[PDB]
Design a binder for these strands. Sequence first.
DNA 1: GAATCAGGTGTC
Length: 222
Amino acid sequence: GIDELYKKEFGIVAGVDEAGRGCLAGPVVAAAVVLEKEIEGINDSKQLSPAKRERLLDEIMEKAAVGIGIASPEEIDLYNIFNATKLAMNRALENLSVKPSFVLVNGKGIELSVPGTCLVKGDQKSKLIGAASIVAKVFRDRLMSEFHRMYPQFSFHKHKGYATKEHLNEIRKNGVLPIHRLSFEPVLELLTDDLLREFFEKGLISENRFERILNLLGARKS
DNA sequence: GAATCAGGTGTC
Ligand SMILES: [Mg+2]
Ligand SMILES: [Mg+2]
């Protein structure tokens, strides 16, 4: 209903949502979705089991136009998680072949390159947002599972990079990676000067990133 | 699903 009201006043409306904000590693992912057919059981990604998201997605990729955007750990560290989130969302809109005239964005305080309105608890007031939320979450979880294959010593396929007990265990035993968000507190506290310079020297992080984290490290514990 | 315990950073 909410969507339809907006659909009638503005025309083609996309719903936008993001996954991965609170993570310690990996990109933030956003999805933009325009959907005209119905998909029963569309609802905030959190109130669904992984398996339900799985099949709810299959249907989405068949009945809807979808654009996916990501912002990297480097961009998070340089721009901050909020600006990086808006970047990913704008990238999602760009990758949507159906160019919307209005956007329904999950949350608060976000102005994208397309006029729109933000909705607190948006992923459950709106089907479009609810569907984007599923797309982002599953797509991101795939990304993290595939980080598991790249860094066997990290159960990214389970904790999806969040600050779980085992993830921190893993960081302490194995070391911070370049895919960790080096500006995030628990990562920063385990990082050392030595390791940072090592990242840079091996070409694992850009000079700009190196410089910003070096200064944060300097300001640390103060 | 709901609870309740954990743990991240933006806005203003
Ligand atoms: Mg979400
Ligand atoms: Mg919510």
